[PDB]
């Protein structure tokens, strides 16, 4: 079949940057059309017939190429233009995409905001304690937050999510979960979260005491 | 206007049938094709075949003639049945109209499909405190099977510095994620804060008021 392969597969741009991305065909095509992908909502129709914008789809967005090698350029990288852009061949069957080129907004260093969240009473009465630690808006992606009991270092009982990057501000948000019985949360007193981070000078800990 | 939207099942069981609806309006599906499109999880985007104006259709080989497309005009359906579905099929699954170029022009929102044995489960909400300016809460959305859930903040109506995390997978085979805002610690003696809750699969509809412990 006609496989399309995309590089980069993962990119980072500087805001206002020139950003080029290619897609190569196994077989020749008379045109390519591309699309943007937003955290896996819906992709949205970006180029078609290679270099036609689709409504709605700002100037600074172009396409180029012709039989086995084409590519999408942004002319300036904005913050809204952070996706992952798909190619697309439907000149011969089966249709085929590419596998993706996930852009990325390179923005200034931003430390996070660090909350702590105690288990609700609600939840300790059905039998387990989960323990939340928040880090709000920051940049790079790159963290570390290690989990300490009456000051003891945790491992293997905590789960983290990471956000994709804000659409307006480009930076991310982290949750680290601690999770443990009831029973084995009220063996111990002091619950804190260490977070070691680049825009932090040292680490920041934010901790609670049962009661 | 062109619009497009999928009706299909949450979870399905491996070896038995997935049937999806996509329910068009703003066009004529005897003039028109409509494509269907997956994307598994964290992956790329697969097309799966096509059912042309004329009733004609084409598919993905690999699909190894599990799949069957078919239309009513009048009743403004296609109708994608796959049939022995495996772990892999697992996907968002999305109807298309094809357009300029012959391209996908117009989608349906897409409809997440789990293929797995496990029991449906709903899941618990538990509140995220506003400890005692700028103030961070939340809901924990625990222990639901299988994916998705959504979570909107007064019915819509707060959506600044709102962030609802990726659930993770927890190992009971469960998943979890929590939503939380920031929100003006001023703001907290006289704005209600409620976390709506819908997970599809269980019909479960929840509404949680957080507030300071
Ligand atoms: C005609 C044809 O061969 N269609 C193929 C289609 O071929 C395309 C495709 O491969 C594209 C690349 O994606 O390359 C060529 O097309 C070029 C450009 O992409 C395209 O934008 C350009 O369009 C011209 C247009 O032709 C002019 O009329 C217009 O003024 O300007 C535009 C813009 O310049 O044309 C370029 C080439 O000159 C290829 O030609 O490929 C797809 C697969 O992706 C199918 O194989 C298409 O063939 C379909 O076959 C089925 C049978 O299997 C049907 O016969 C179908 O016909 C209908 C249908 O039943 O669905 C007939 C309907 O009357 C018609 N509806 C209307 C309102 O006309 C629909 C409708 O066109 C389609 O459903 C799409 O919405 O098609 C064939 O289309």
């Known amino acids: 079949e006609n496989v399309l392969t995309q590089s980069p597969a993962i990119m980072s741009a500087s805001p206002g940057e020139k950003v080029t991305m290619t897609c190569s065909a196994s077989?020749?095509?008379?045109?390519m059309h591309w699309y943007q992908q937003k955290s896996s909502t819906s992709p949205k129709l970006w180029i078609y017939?290679?270099?036609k914008l689709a409504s709605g789809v700002p100037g600074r967005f172009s396409g180029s190429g012709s039989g086995n090698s084409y590519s999408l350029t942004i002319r300036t990288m904005e913050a809204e233009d952070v996706a992952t852009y798909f190619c697309?061949?439907?000149?011969?069957?089966?249709?085929?995409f590419g596998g993706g080129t996930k852009l990325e907004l390179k923005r200034t260093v931003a430390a996070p905001s660090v909350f702590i969240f105690p288990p609700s009473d609600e939840q300790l009465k059905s039998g387990t304690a989960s323990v939340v630690c928040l880090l709000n808006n920051f940049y790079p992606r790159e963290a570390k937050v290690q989990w300490k009991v009456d000051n003891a270092l945790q491992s293997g009982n905590s789960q983290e999510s990471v956000t994709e990057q804000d659409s307006k501000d480009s930076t991310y948000s982290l949750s680290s979960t601690l999770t443990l019985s009831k029973a084995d949360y009220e063996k111990h007193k002091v619950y804190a979260c260490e977070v070691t981070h680049q825009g932090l000078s040292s680490p920041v800990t934010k901790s609670f005491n049962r009661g | 206007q062109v619009q497009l939207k999928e009706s299909g099942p949450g979870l399905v069981a491996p070896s038995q049938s997935l049937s999806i609806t996509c329910t068009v309006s703003?066009?004529?599906?005897?003039?028109?094709?409509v494509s269907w499109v997956r994307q598994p999880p964290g992956k790329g985007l697969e097309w799966l075949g096509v059912?042309?104006?004329?009733?004609?259709?084409n598919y993905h080989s690999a699909l190894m003639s599990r799949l069957r497309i078919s239309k009513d005009n009048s009743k403004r359906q296609v109708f994608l049945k796959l049939n022995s579905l495996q772990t892999d099929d697992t996907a968002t699954y999305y109807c298309?109209?094809?357009?300029?170029?012959?391209?996908?022009?117009?989608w349906g929102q897409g409809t997440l499909v789990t293929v797995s044995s496990a029991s449906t489960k709903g899941p618990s909400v538990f509140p995220l405190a506003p400890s005692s300016g700028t103030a961070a809460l939340g809901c924990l959305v625990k222990d639901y099977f299988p994916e998705p859930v959504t979570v909107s903040w007064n019915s819509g109506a707060l959506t600044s510095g709102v962030h609802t995390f990726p659930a993770v997978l927890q190992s009971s085979g469960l998943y979890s994620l929590s939503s939380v805002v920031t929100v003006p610690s001023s703001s907290l003696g006289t704005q209600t804060y409620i976390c709506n809750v819908n997970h599809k699969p269980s019909n479960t509809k929840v509404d949680k008021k957080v507030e300071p412990a």
């Open positions: 298309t109209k094809p357009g300029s170029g012959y391209a996908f022009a117009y």
């Open positions: 703003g066009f004529s599906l005897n003039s028109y094709g």
């Open positions: 059912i042309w104006g004329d009733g004609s259709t």
């Open positions: 077989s020749s095509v008379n045109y």
């Open positions: 017939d290679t270099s």
């Open positions: 697309f061949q439907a000149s011969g069957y089966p249709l085929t």
